[PDB]
Amino acid sequence: ATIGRISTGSKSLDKLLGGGIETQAITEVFGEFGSGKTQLAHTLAVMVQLPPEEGGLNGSVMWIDTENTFRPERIREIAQNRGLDPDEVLKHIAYARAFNSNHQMLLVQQAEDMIKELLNTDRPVKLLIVDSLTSHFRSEYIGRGALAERQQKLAKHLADLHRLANLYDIAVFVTNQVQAHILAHSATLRVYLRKGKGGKRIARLIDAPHLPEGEAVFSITEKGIED
Numbered sequence: 001a002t003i004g005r006i007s008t009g010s011k012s013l014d015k016l017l018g019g020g021i022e023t024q025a026i027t028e029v030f031g032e033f034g035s036g037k038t039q040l041a042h043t044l045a046v047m048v049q050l051p052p053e054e055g056g057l058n059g060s061v062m063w064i065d066t067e068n069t070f071r072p073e074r075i076r077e078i079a080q081n082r083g084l085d086p087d088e089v090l091k092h093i094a095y096a097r098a099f100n101s102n103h104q105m106l107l108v109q110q111a112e113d114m115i116k117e118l119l120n121t122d123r124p125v126k127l128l129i130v131d132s133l134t135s136h137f138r139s140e141y142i143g144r145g146a147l148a149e150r151q152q153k154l155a156k157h158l159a160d161l162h163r164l165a166n167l168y169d170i171a172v173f174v175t176n177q178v179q180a181h182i183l184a185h186s187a188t189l190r191v192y193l194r195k196g197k198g199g200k201r202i203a204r205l206i207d208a209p210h211l212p213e214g215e216a217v218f219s220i221t222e223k224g225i226e227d
């Protein structure tokens with residue numbers, strides 16, 4: 001099936017991504033605390049709900065939160081400032097907090113149930129967010145022997161997410177806090193975010209040889225993100 005794209009709200013970042021984030025893929029954003037990962041997640045959760053000629057997919061959202069960082073009022077602000085009803089936008093986001101990494105893995109299985117229900121409705125699930133993908137794995141799997149065990153469990157979690165993306169035509173968007181590399185990763189596309197000067201955020205594609213090699217620049221605003 002043909003893939004869909006979701007505009008991020010920034011034309012610069014959209015060009016870096018070839019039009020937006022893709023369905024049938026996992027896009028991982030990574031960078032230090034404060035680099036804009038969660039604001040990009042909030043913006044995408046609104047953008048995907050727009051019609052396709054405005055860069056959305058007329059889609060619903062599912063959001064797994066490991067750090068209590070989802071903010072419904074920020075959704076409402078972004079929606080209002082993009083011409084959308086804030087409470088309708090919120091109603092098409094299903095939200096769950098993952099208590100630990102094993103609960104996080106179970107929540108991906110639960111998510112399939114709602115995905116199936118909405119699949120042939122006018123707003124099927126088109127975006128599944130995991131913010132943060134790695135935080136519980138990093139606190140639970142630590143010390144001698146933990147590198148191999150943690151990487152194996154992560155890879156299985158990511159395989160479950162790839163299955164949902166590919167089987168149900170969903171964009172999976174995940175965040176990863178990284179304090180300034182040797183570990184393997186299995187996301188489809190990895191985007192490094194960082195702070196720039198003048199309040200700007202800078203994005204670069206990592207290990208993607210046949211895609212754009214420049215950098216996108218964006219700001220965080222009342223519309224979420226924009227150039």
Ligand SMILES: C[C@H](NC(=O)[C@@H]1CCCN1C(=O)[C@H](Cc1c[nH]cn1)NC(=O)c1cc2ccccc2cc1N)C(N)=O
Binds near residue numbers: 062063091093096107
């Ligand atoms: C934006 C937010 N929207 C809600 O609160 C809307 C209102 C109506 C129910 N909503 C939910 O999110 C419900 C709350 C709930 C939990 N158990 C029973 N009901 N989510 C779920 O059911 C759920 C979500 C998942 C997300 C990802 C993965 C697996 C999930 C599995 C789940 N069971 C808001 N602030 O208004």
